[PDB]
Amino acid sequence: VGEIFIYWSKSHNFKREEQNFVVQNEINNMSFLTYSVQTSLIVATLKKMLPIGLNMCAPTDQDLIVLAKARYALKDTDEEVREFLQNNLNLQGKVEGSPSLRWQMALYRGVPGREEDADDPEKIVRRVQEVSAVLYHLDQTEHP
Amino acid sequence: ELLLQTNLINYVTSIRPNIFVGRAEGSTQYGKWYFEVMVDEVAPFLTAQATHLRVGWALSEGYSPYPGGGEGWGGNGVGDDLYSYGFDGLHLWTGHVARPVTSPGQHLLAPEDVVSCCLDLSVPSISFRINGCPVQGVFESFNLDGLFFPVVSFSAGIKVRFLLGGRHGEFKFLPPPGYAPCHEAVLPRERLHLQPIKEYRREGPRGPHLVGPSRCLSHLDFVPCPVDTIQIVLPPHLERIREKLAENIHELWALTRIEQGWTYGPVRDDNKRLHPCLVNFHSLPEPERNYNLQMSGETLKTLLALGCHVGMADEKAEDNLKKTKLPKTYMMSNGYKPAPLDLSHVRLTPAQTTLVDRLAENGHNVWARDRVAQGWSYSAVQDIPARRNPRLVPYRLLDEATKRSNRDSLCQAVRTLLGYGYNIEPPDQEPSQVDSQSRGDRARIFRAEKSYAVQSGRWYFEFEAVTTGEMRVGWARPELRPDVELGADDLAYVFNGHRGQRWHLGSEPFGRPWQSGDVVGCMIDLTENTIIFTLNGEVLMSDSGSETAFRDIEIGDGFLPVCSLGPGQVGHLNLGQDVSSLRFFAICGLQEGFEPFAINMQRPVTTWFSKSLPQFEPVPLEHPHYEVARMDGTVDTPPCLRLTHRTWGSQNSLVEMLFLRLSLPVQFHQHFRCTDNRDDPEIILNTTTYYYSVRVFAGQEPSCVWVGWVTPDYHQHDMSFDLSKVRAVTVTMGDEQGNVHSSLKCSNCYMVWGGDFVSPGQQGRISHTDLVIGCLVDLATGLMTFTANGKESNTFFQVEPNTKLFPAVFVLPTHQNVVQFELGKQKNIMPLSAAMFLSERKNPAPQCPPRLEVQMLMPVSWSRMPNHFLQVDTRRAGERLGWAVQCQEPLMMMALHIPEENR
Amino acid sequence: GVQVETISPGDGRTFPKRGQTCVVHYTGMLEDGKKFDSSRDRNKPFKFTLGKQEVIRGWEEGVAQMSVGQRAKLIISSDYAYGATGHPGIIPPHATLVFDVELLKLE
16 A cells, blocks of 8 residues: 555655546545545555554564655665665664663564564565655655 | 641541432421441551541532542531531541440440441431440431431541341341331432442543542432313213223233233132232223223323323214224133224324323322321331332333333323324423523533643643543643633533534534544644644534634643533543553654643643632632722721622622621630620630621611631522521530430521511512621530621521631612621720731720621532542442442542641 | 640550650641641650659640550640640640640650
8 A cells, every 4th residue: 555655655646547537537535534535545645554564573673664754855876775774784773772662562572473574674665765755755645 | 827837637538328218398208317337457547647537427428528629627528517426436526526435345446346336217316226225326417408328437457338228138137116228218210329429530441540520319309290180171072982092902911911910800800810809990990990991081181281181183083993802812701802093093293102101200200199188108128017119100100011001001092082083182292491400510520630731742642431421621721710610611622512503702503523432533633723623533613614623822821631521421531641541642642743731741730620628718819799898997987897799780880699608717715614895804805705797788688697606617698598598506414314414506607687686567679778686605615696687686606615707798789889898896895807817816996807708608619639549449248348439549648738727 | 724635545454654664656736736846747756754844744644544555635724734835836826726635655
């Protein structure tokens, strides 16, 4: 769903085509949820799936997510952001830094099975790059 | 007397069995009651303050001792107000006054002491016995406008046992002749046990539960009030049926008898199930057939009286009606088969079923009224010789078993009517809003302390609804008022999920109602200025479909978690100090970036609640309706404090009882003395009499004004106030053989009704003159007198030394100009200022300093909740040991005492 | 003050004798009912020897009438109390004093 939303944001014809479809068919997006960018199911579905995506990002990764969002603002390719995170594996939110990263991290540890994960730097970069891209494009969408 | 005083005091708590007894005209309740309390362990000094332990009686409505600080120096228990009457081994306690009482071998309640309490509601009187030895003192002539219950008040360090008789504690001494064990007063629908009183808090599996007000019975709830039926006149077309209805009900009755196994026999042998009346209704004896014919006639007459319209519809159906076949086995020695008319076709409508309920209720109430007139009374254990019955209670209080046992017969009767083909129109059930309570003042509001107000960020908290009734939860501003409903003004954004509404400056449909056990998650996002509610993790949406509940919220001074529980409601507020305790934070809010409200606090968040104890507070300078003017003294008038009604004679005008006092009291001396219009210097400088007047302005009906004094512990916000509502009691001490030594009258309101001074001719017509009522107090003798328009009145009062009295006026406004406190004087009589202020003790010139001001009684006020509560263990020790109450862990508090107000 | 009213009974036999040292707890209140002193607040019994005029005449005469282990209320008139002078800052002039006294032991 995130890749589809990223396409919706990048490509620009797709926006007119979605809008024309919805207006021409007079299908009420509100009925499905329960015309406008908010009504657009492409962004609504991703906003609904987003928590499930953030849930695979450990709290320590928030600063890396911000950095990756900065790169995507610089208009770097996915590979460029992947390499950026790979080399800047450091700059990772430290638990002692703030109490927030303490209680958040404790709760996150609490979830069963979240002990072997985050062992793989490639895994961390995967997840940070993906969620950062999604958040960046969602930002552009929500604030024109 | 000027600086605020501090001291450490013990927490005190009260425990009662669920036994309630009272008196009312035509009530079904017995008058005399008896119980005992046996003391197993007492630590005289578990802390630096003496251990508290008092036993006695209290009145249902009014005895509300909240944990913490109250009257006097806190630690309020039995006898610390005029609603309870207690005994502590050495003193009789009432009105926060302890009066020593003689007894053989006096001593403070100690281990192995048995206190026997007797309550005779006929006199009325309360008496005590210590280890069987009479206590030479009695309470009498107290108010009887509620239900009385046994009570023990205590501090930490006790273990006692209620002995209520029967299987709930065997009495150690024989009850005095005529008194009944208190275990007989347990209502049919309830089971005996020990409970706290007016609790706003309790423990539960996951933490503390907040509790709303408890619905309490009234002494008038035991008065059966059936609808009159003698004035009903039976119509002929109902009369024709009356007979056949009697026969049909008899057929059904005999059918049930034989089903249960009744056989026909000449005499009442229930052991052998013999039944002479099992013979046919036609063969039934004439008196009995007629008796049944009556009950039928009463049934139809009640149908009419309720307002039901009954009319013949179809004679064809009546003809079609066929008696059901009866098995030959059903033939008993009666030589008859009680054939009932098969009414299977007949269906009852829901309104008809409610009607059946109403008929059953009316019939039972009529029966109960008749038995009460005979002289019967209620009792958990039946006693035919004593005219005590387990059913002689108004229908509403009966257990389901008997209620259905009656509804069955009534429903069969109405079935017979419908089968005979009668249109049965229930009355139009015109709505009758009971409004028994003030809604704004009823539901208890619990909020976080103001210092926790959040002005930025994204905050989350949870509220589990243990019950499914009226409860609201959300975010409030720090200046939230305690007497307004949540969300009725702009100071709170809340969600009320009994019907699914959002509340802010009014109601709007939103979300869906919860069910028991549902957890509402409240989120406030101050970066977006929004408020969101989730029910069991799913965001609640408006009808429009918006996810948010409120938008465009001004930050102002911040927001606080708030909830309100209506009567009989229970909630659980989880502010998230233990993030694992939250049940849906992960599901919704954690990834959205909301933080639990109390995530990083070392200690639990302090809360405040809306205490419904009326208290006197200064009249607000911006009150929408009431204005007070400080009038300066002139050459011919003294200083005055005048009251006016700003919004009189207009739409939105508020017209209700107003209870006013003056901020400062006059205090009587410690010891009372043993047994042209210019003041005479020596008389005026040696007088101990002080004066103040109240001018009721012309147009203000004197019949709506009460003038006099109140003591520091007046807390009655009675919208229908009368001098008969004033709390009063008499404490009488005597020797072993009577010979009363003293009889003191105690009260908290000393007033004269303005209607006493209205001329009999003037009555019924508005006057054009002012009514001036002067009040005189002798601080050296304890005497209080009143004058009206210069004429001395017949009302006088006597108070004890050290008594504090506030000038007071209770008025129902009927004009724009209502009343005026005139702080003047009389010849050789000093003004109030001379008694109120030490520096003016010898100054005859009237004054009204800034500290002297008008205060009004406000019904609700904010009160801090203790962070820790006494741990009381209550359990049934045994069928002979009784019900044990235990409290062993000490708990103290630092109390700040306002000297002038004695609280 | 001095008039003594029992609260809890003592042994009823052993009474203080001149020269003995009495150990007590007490809680002092003005006749109005305002606390002004308490040994229990300091959590340490007060010890005094009869006949040495260490305590006011009210105590001297009252504690002498209490048996060991007895708790009692002593009501002391001003004349037997600090009297006209009044312990400045604590006791107003011409004040009657009410004490709640437990006589723990003699020594």
